[PDB]
Amino acid sequence: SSIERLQQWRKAALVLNASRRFRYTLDLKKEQETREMRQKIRSHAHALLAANRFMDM
């Protein structure tokens, strides 16, 4: 069946694409969480350095 053969091709490509989308979804989460945590720790380090400058004068 010509229609069944072509659908089988499409279904394979869609499954590959779906897997890629699931993965990309994770990569986005991870990059956002990483930036968040980093900016958080950095802002605290800068706060400490600011304090230390007041002690150093």
Partner 1 sequence: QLTDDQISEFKEAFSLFDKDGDGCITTKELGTVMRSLGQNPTEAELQDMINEVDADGNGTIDFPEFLNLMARKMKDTDSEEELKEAFRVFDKDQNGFISAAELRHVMTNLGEKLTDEEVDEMIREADVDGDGQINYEEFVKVMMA
For 17, the enclosing helix (H) or strand (E) is: helix 2-56
Nearest approach, Cβ of 10 to partner 1 (angstroms)? 6
**C-alpha 33: how far from chain center:** 7
Position 32 contacts partner 1 (CB under 8 A): no
Binding marks (x or -) toward partner 1, 2..21, rule CB under 8 A? Answer: x--xxxxxxxxxxxxxxxxx
**Contact residues: partner 1, CB under 8 A:** 2, 5-26, 28-29, 33-34, 37-38, 40-55, 57
